[PDB]
Design a protein around this ligand. Structure first.
Ligand SMILES: CN[C@@H]1C[C@H]2O[C@@](C)([C@@H]1OC)n1c3ccccc3c3c4c(c5c6ccccc6n2c5c31)C(=O)N[C@@H]4O
Lengths: 258, 297
């Protein structure tokens, strides 16, 4: 903690490079697409809300899926099995009270069996070689939040929202590290709510400037603008909740003025 | 998979795992094998094993018992650990007539603080430091073991499992059910262990949460808003708690010198925020002359 803030930040920066999925992996998957991946993650978002899981669990589960799919070629009828095993693994890693396995079996409306989920759980662990302590956008965001002059709960919730949105679209977002997406999401959230900008103190912490974040920020800005029009809407619905200060109802800026 | 290992004897046991001393037939290396039982028709791989393994592969440090390998099987999970000859409690039970010499205590403390500062700077809480989980070899190394209860923490932490740390080594913020606890809980446990190394008896041997709390209060004084801002706001704080006066610290652990007492008092600070960090404690004058004395077993 605050004796280790910087040690931890440094270490997460080295680990996010190690745990990065391969950018081009969907090209290499014969039977699945970005679009099918989007469907899975959006379902996982609903599972998350149905079981009241941490946002961290969600971010980990997606990290496991992207890494699993970086090395293992998967049929469309099995994508949701991978996703269930990932989310179960994520919950055991991160939740105080993980849902029991039967609850994971149940949420896949009798598509698969308990024995299948548990064998997939095993295969996932083998494929990831047990490297479950992956850094996520969530873990960086939470650190960046400490640099708000007045802490603003709307900035925080909106940052998480934009962070979550970027989980859905592999196309652009797989090319950016969690620390860079978080940077872009924090600045975009700051700007939208308060008119403020990526704070100088985060430049000294991360070494990132508005200039270095710009590419991701260009993509995230568009994703924000087009959010109500996306085929997948579970995140928008999720962040309508008072628990997240209804930040998905806030209006995006039309320009970033960069 | 297990064909290169040769079990020598059963050595200990957990809730899922049985631990054997074993030997690598090809390299000759003596290792500890933790056999973890797996059930298909239940819950799968236990979360304790999921955390112990993933956290332990990140923690390579001379004072953290090293996970050498994980051996799979559709039925079983075998963890291969570096082997150490005993735990700290057994060493203390066998030092029970003469005591542990101060050079050795200083060396052990300094090594533990190193392992602990390595965990915290890698965002890991151990959450079960007690002398049974601290293994010692014949070279005078001591190392942290059993990461079964550990967890990866986030930077402002959030609320984690409350049911945490063996009672005697459990910190007051956990006892008072704070919303948030952090690295300071491990330091509290090491404080207790530091005291226990000196006298060879537990510092706060309670029987319940309230009993544990009252034993702490009677030794360190009952905390008020002065010593610990927010204490009276804690979820399990009660205004009816007896008010004990803080004792002379030289009576808490009589054989300790000024530096030791100073260091111990920083590890047993009520307020998690002022309690010393493992990192900061490495530079304490208590350790100005630390050697690594290699005991006599
Ligand atoms: C004092 N308590 C037990 C003593 C005995 O078994 C236990 C279960 C406990 O040791 C921490 N145990 C573990 C539990 C979980 C993970 C690792 C270990 C482990 C290792 C060892 C030993 C050990 C060596 C010599 C005598 C008893 C021992 N015990 C253990 C271990 C070891 O050498 N390396 C492991 O990390």
């Amino acid at each position: 903690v605050p004796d280790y803030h910087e040690d931890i930040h440094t270490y997460l920066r080295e680990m996010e490079v190690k745990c990065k999925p391969k950018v081009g992996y969907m090209k290499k998957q014969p039977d699945i697409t970005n679009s099918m991946r989007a469907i899975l993650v959006d379902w996982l978002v609903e599972v998350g809300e149905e079981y009241k899981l941490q946002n961290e669990t969600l971010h980990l589960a997606v990290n496991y899926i992207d890494r699993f799919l970086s090395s293992m070629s998967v049929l469309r009828g099995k994508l949701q099995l991978v996703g269930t095993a990932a989310m179960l693994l994520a919950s055991k890693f991160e939740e105080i009270y993980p849902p029991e396995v039967a609850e994971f079996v149940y949420i896949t409306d009798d598509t698969y069996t308990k024995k299948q989920v548990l064998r997939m759980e095993h295969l996932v662990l083998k494929v990831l070689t047990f490297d479950l302590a992956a850094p996520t956008v969530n873990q960086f965001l939470t650190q960046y939040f400490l640099h708000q002059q007045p802490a603003n709960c709307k900035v925080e919730s909106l940052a998480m929202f934009l962070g979550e949105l970027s989980l859905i679209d592999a196309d652009p977002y797989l090319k950016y590290l969690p620390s860079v997406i978080a940077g872009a999401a924090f600045h975009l959230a700051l700007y939208t709510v308060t008119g403020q900008s990526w704070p100088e103190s985060l430049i000294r912490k991360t070494g990132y400037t508005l200039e270095s974040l710009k590419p991701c920020l260009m993509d995230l800005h568009q994703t924000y603008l087009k959010a109500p029009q996306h085929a997948q809407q579970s995140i928008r619905e999720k962040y309508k909740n008072s628990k997240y200060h209804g930040v998905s109802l806030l209006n995006p800026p039309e320009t970033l003025n960069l | 998979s297990m064909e290169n290992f040769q079990k020598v004897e059963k050595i200990g046991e957990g809730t899922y795992g049985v631990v054997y001393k074993a030997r690598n037939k090809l390299t000759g290396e003596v290792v500890a094998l933790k056999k973890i039982r797996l059930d298909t028709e239940t819950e799968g791989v236990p979360s304790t094993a999921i955390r112990e393994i993933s956290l332990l592969k990140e923690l390579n440090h001379p004072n953290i018992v090293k996970l050498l390998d994980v051996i799979h099987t559709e039925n079983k999970l075998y963890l291969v650990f570096e082997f150490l000859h005993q735990d700290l409690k057994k060493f203390m039970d066998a030092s029970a007539l003469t005591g542990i010499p101060l050079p050795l205590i200083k060396s052990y403390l300094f090594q533990l603080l190193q392992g602990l500062a390595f965990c915290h700077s890698h965002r890991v809480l151990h959450r079960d430091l007690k002398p049974q989980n601290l293994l010692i070899n014949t070279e005078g190394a001591i190392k942290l073991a059993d990461f079964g209860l550990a967890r990866a923490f986030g930077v402002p932490v959030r609320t984690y499992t409350h049911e945490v740390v063996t009672l005697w080594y459990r910190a007051p913020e956990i006892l008072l059910g704070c919303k948030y606890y952090s690295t300071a809980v491990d330091i509290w446990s090491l404080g207790c262990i530091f005291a226990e190394m000196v006298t060879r008896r537990a510092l706060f041997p309670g029987d319940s949460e309230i009993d544990q709390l009252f034993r702490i209060f009677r030794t360190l004084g009952t905390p008020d808003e002065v010593v610990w801002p927010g204490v009276t706001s804690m979820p399990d704080y009660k205004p009816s708690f007896p008010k004990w006066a803080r004792q002379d610290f030289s009576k808490v652990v009589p054989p300790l010198d000024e530096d030791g007492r100073s260091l111990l008092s920083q590890m047993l600070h009520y307020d998690p925020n002022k309690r010393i960090s493992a990192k900061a404690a490495l530079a304490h004058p208590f350790f100005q002359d630390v050697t690594k004395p290699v005991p006599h077993l």
